[PDB]
Paper text:
NanH consists solely of the catalytic GH33 domain. The structures of NanHGH33 and NanJGH33 display the characteristic 6-bladed β-propeller fold seen in exo-acting sialidase GH33 domains. The inserted domain is not present in NanHGH33 and the RMSD of NanHGH33 with the other two structures is 1.7 Å. NanHGH33, however, has a considerably different organization in the active site region that interacts with the glycerol moiety, suggesting this may contribute to the ability of this enzyme to recognize additional acetylated variants of sialic acid. The most notable difference in NanH is in the loop structures surrounding the active site. In NanHGH33 loops on 3-blades forming the rim of one side of the cavity are extended, thus deepening the active site. The center blade of the three has a solvent exposed tyrosine residue, Y310, that projects into the active site. In contrast, NanH is predicted to be localized to the cytoplasm of the bacterium (i.e. it lacks any obvious export signals), suggesting it does not interact directly with the host. The biological role of NanH is more likely in processing glycans that are imported with their terminal sialic acids intact.
Numbering used by the authors: 20 to 382
């Protein structure tokens, strides 16, 4: 597989890369992102977000820093954990978490984390240039319905979606002060004005849920989320754009994730030529357990043939993850093409999976 971001040969002399992201553009351009983890694998470190862009279907790549941290702390300033979407205008939005101090974003403080913010950039030239950073949390003018007991929140790490009428929906994760503890939950945020302003949904039914993505299905939102220490990815459905949730049985509990903590993965919808809507999920099998996160696999469900069990399509990364930080992945599906980016021993690798989609599509 192509090494897209190479810890042993990159223009930033970065020691590590983590948290990859991919969008297949309507015109065939491939846009990807990654944390530039300059000094090593740690989350609590100095990080910027790179882009890598290809106009020859992944043969060659042009690299850039898509978003810089706040440059306040040479050890801890970081923007990281990209969540992206392409809107119906073709605008590309990236939302990242921003901090500049040591300590887990959700658990370190009992009040709103003072160095925390959510930063947005967008591109109206298909990822060639980016806006200035837009701070979504410094005031109350950009995001509605943020809870007063928020410790912090960020995107779900992956891709958002667009509803039938153009509404943008982004997966998110939040930490909330509740009865003298901090509990973290998945949720969504949505924008009806091309990302200028947002409204936050309500938390899903279970805590210990974090990184996630949602698909749209007949107006409903279906979320596949990391559910820590359950052994599986939870799934929930919302019929009111994320105000209420219930368990979605056909996917809940069906993708197992091994012993220990959960892991980020991706979840997207494709419509095959027979009209069926299928869900594709990427995540480590983690048969070896905890943070080994071996065998990043791709799974399929057919929402129009739900008695057929979830199927393992392929394993793009049939290797142990690096315990320092590995296992994350991102699928993108567009115009009958399917691509993946994933963590691979401190690098990011890229693969075109379109031949597997052809097998599924049965033309």
């Amino acid at each position: 597989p192509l090494i897209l971001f190479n810890k042993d040969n990159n223009i930033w002399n970065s020691k590590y890369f983590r948290i990859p992201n991919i969008q297949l553009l309507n015109d065939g351009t491939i846009l990807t992102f990654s944390d530039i983890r300059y000094n090593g694998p740690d989350d609590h470190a100095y990080i910027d977000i790179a882009s890598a862009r290809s106009t020859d279907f992944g043969k060659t790549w042009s690299y850039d820093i898509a978003m810089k941290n706040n440059r306040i702390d040479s050890t801890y300033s970081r923007v990281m954990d990209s969540t992206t979407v392409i809107t119906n205008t073709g605008r590309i939005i990236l939302i990242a978490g921003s901090w500049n101090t040591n300590g887990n974003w959700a658990m370190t403080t009992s009040t709103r984390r003072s160095d925390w913010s959510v930063q947005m950039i967008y591109s109206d030239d298909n990822g060639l240039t980016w806006s200035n950073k837009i701070d979504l949390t410094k005031d109350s003018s950009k995001v509605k319905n943020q809870p007063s007991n928020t410790i912090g929140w960020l995107g779900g790490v992956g891709s958002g979606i667009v509803m039938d009428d153009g509404t943008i929906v982004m997966p998110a994760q939040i930490s909330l002060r509740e009865n003298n503890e901090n509990n973290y939950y998945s949720l969504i945020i949505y924008s009806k004005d091309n990302g200028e302003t947002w409204t936050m949904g309500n938390k899903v039914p279970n805590s210990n849920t974090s990184e996630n993505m949602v698909i749209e299905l007949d107006g409903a939102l279906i979320m596949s989320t990391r559910y820590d220490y359950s052994g599986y990815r939870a799934a929930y459905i919302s019929h009111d754009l994320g105000s209420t949730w219930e368990i979605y049985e056909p996917l809940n509990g069906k993708v197992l994730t091994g012993k220990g903590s959960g892991c980020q993965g991706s979840f997207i919808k494709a419509t095959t030529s027979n009209g069926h809507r299928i869900g594709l999920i990427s995540a480590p099998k983690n048969t070896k357990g905890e943070y080994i996160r071996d065998n990043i696999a791709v799974y399929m469900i057919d929402f129009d043939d739900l008695s057929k069990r979830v199927q393992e399509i392929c394993i793009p990364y049939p290797k142990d993850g690096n315990k320092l930080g590995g296992g994350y992945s991102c699928l993108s599906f567009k115009n009958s093409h399917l691509s993946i980016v994933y963590e691979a021993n401190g690098n990011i690798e890229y693969q075109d999976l379109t031949p597997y989609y052809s097998l599924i599509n049965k033309q």
